[model samples]
Target: YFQGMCLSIPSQVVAVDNERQSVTVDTLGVRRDVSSHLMTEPLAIGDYVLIHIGFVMNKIDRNDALQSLELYQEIVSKLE
Candidate 1:
């Protein structure tokens, strides 16, 4: 089995499928649907999140997410 990496990317909530309790997250032109279970909080159009394992663990600031992940990588390296 292959383990997956977790990343808090800057994705936009472009659309809401109210019927399905899910929303489409747009990473620029790319799009994906995530369950509303990860979005218990009041999510507005254009809100961003830090998703992991098909679950949005938390919400993140857009600017922080959009920034290069150099700092994050550096921290991980230090742990090792």
Candidate 2:
């Protein structure tokens, strides 16, 4: 059987380049740059954000992000 799902992972911003409208984020240790063109609010390093289709859709609460990371870690560990 096959199941379908769509998910957006939460990531922490490690670097921001406002001029380029992009930010480098760490997604559970994997780092990459994503477009911030859809963001209306300013982003700073250490902020948490939600990524969708290579774009930063919105900011996330620090505590909430950490909690989600913990659950993700558990799922990853189980798969290993």
Candidate 3:
């Protein structure tokens, strides 16, 4: 038996709708709208955010987000 790990992926904010309190994030090339109501800081295009379930957890620094994205790519490639 193997243990399962839960992970959150870093996504880039491509679009934001403050009125609806939602933001569209791009994970690689895939995009989806997620609720930003849980966030304390305002979200804007080009921001990097962490997503859990269907909500934005928080904002992340550009450098940190890029590093995490690179690592995720490596992991996916290795798995394939």
Candidate 4:
């Protein structure tokens, strides 16, 4: 088994899918659906979050998310 590694990305919540307990998030413009199970803090559409393993770990700030987005883009560029 490929035992262990994980990465959380910062994404902005675009839409909430209440029926699924999930939200559609935009990570560097790439939209994805993620679980909203761990959002203990108050959250709603337009909020930024740190997501990992299909779940939102926590809410984050816009500046933080912008910095993280640059990192993600750098990684994607290198991977291509």
Q: How does each model score on TM-score? A: 0.51, 0.48, 0.50, 0.47
Candidate 2 segments exceeding 4 Å error: 1-4, 53-80
Query: What tens digits encode model 2's per-residue C-alpha lDDT throughout 1-80?
Result: 11124566778999888899888999899999878875657778998877445433678999999989999999999997
Name the better of 3 and 4 by TM-score: 3
In candidate 4, stretches whose alpha carbon ends up further than 4 angstroms from where it belongs are 1-9, 52-80
Alpha-carbon deviation at 22 in model 4, angstroms = 1.0
Per-residue lDDT, model 4, residue 12, is 89
Q: Model 1: per-residue lDDT, tens digit, 1-80?
A: 11265556778898898899899998867999988877758887888865545542677897887675778888899997
lDDT of each: 0.77, 0.79, 0.79, 0.79
- Model 3 whole-model lDDT (C-alpha atoms): 0.79
Candidate 4 TM-score over all chains jointly: 0.47
Can you list the residue pairs that collide in candidate 3?
A: none
lDDT of 4 by residue, 9-77 (tens): 778889998888988889888997866776758679998887435432677898999989999999999
